Amino acid sequence: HMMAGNDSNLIWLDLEMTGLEPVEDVILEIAIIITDSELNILAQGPIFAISQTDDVLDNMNPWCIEHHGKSGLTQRCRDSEVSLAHATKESLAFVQEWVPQGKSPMCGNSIGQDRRFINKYMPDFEDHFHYRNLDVSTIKELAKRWKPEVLESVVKTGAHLALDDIKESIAELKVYRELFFKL
Amino acid sequence: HMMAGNDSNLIWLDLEMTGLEPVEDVILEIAIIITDSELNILAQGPIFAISQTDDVLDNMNPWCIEHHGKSGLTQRCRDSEVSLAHATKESLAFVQEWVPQGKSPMCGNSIGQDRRFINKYMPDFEDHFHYRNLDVSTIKELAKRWKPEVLESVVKTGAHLALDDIKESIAELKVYRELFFKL
């Protein structure tokens, strides 16, 4: 692929989890997408729901069992045989074809929260990325203050799973690329 | 002081630390600036060099021994009697005076990294912020790819002192506001 190894390609990711604090909580779902510098979806990596026992799946926060319930996720985690070290091996591998090492920031909405869980649980996948984040939610906060009509064009999406979400982030940033940035 | 309490005020911060890994490293300095939504500086918070022992100061990572050595920070931390507890309480009270709880993201360059330290070491202070980050380095990464010439106007400065580092973040964002956003 002529684009593969382009220095300016971006790794986008979302995670789902059992909650907000890494000390306690664990990664349930993970999805990746690669884009070029202009935000064209170049390639997908794997979408892993991770194997998590019923004790863990029963002891999430009340937000988590209610929303990961109604959106067959917790059921996907039970029925999954995917390990976290196998999601990591397949996650890294996918990414590494596409970008040189330490080039792309980690991209997503509130991607620092995700990077916390990546940093503890998946520390070798993290090592491929530039230390920076490209947090789409930074631009949202600027839009809210500087040009909030722009938010009318942003598609909200009720879902809470890792591909729905990441795809939603890419497309948010597309809207800002078109109506908020001057390029 | 008229703008004290406005929902859309931004809390800006920069920390210096003994190193890049919260697990082992600690906070040596914090500076906070409040701006309005438009980036007019409204207040400067109290700057603290956090008291540390000769044991901590002499065995931080070699980057730090040199640049904190150079900068007069290592020495400000020797003479300081400021506990992280006091710095936290004071910084919280300052920020409460200017922005309602839960409204402002945490603002600066690669601010997710400073959030890691605040989360571990100053949890009460973190609780003031919205969960989101307003990361100027996200916009720097976008400018690199989409309008790299804008970076000629960004002013860089060598100082690695919290106050100087945050004023520089604010000013970098002012440059993008003018050259890179379509307001």
Ligand SMILES: O=c1ccn([C@@H]2O[C@H](COP(=O)(O)O)[C@@H](O)[C@H]2O)c(=O)[nH]1
């Ligand atoms: O009110 C909330 C919203 C989200 N989450 C956590 O944040 C993770 C990522 O959320 P998102 O990608 O659905 O925003 C979820 O899997 C869940 O663990 C919560 O604990 N409470």
Ligand SMILES: O=c1ccn([C@@H]2O[C@H](COP(=O)(O)O)[C@@H](O)[C@H]2O)c(=O)[nH]1
């Ligand atoms: O109270 C909350 C609600 C959501 N999230 C996190 O915020 C992100 C959603 O991003 P945003 O698009 O709302 O900024 C997810 O990573 C989710 O885990 C929090 O940390 N705290």
Ligand SMILES: O=c1ccn([C@@H]2O[C@H](COP(=O)(O)O)[C@@H](O)[C@H]2O)c(=O)[nH]1
């Ligand atoms: O090459 C570096 C760059 C940064 N830092 C750590 O990150 C902190 C914050 O960086 P900055 O605000 O000076 O950029 C420094 O106090 C230092 O602990 C290093 O250890 N080595």
Ligand SMILES: O=c1ccn([C@@H]2O[C@H](COP(=O)(O)O)[C@@H](O)[C@H]2O)c(=O)[nH]1
């Ligand atoms: O090699 C480096 C240099 C800086 N930093 C972190 O990034 C910040 C500088 O951010 P930026 O302005 O380069 O994005 C510093 O405060 C530091 O904590 C790193 O992790 N690695």
Ligand SMILES: [Mn+2]
């Ligand atoms: Mn998310």
Ligand SMILES: [Mn+2]
């Ligand atoms: Mn810094």
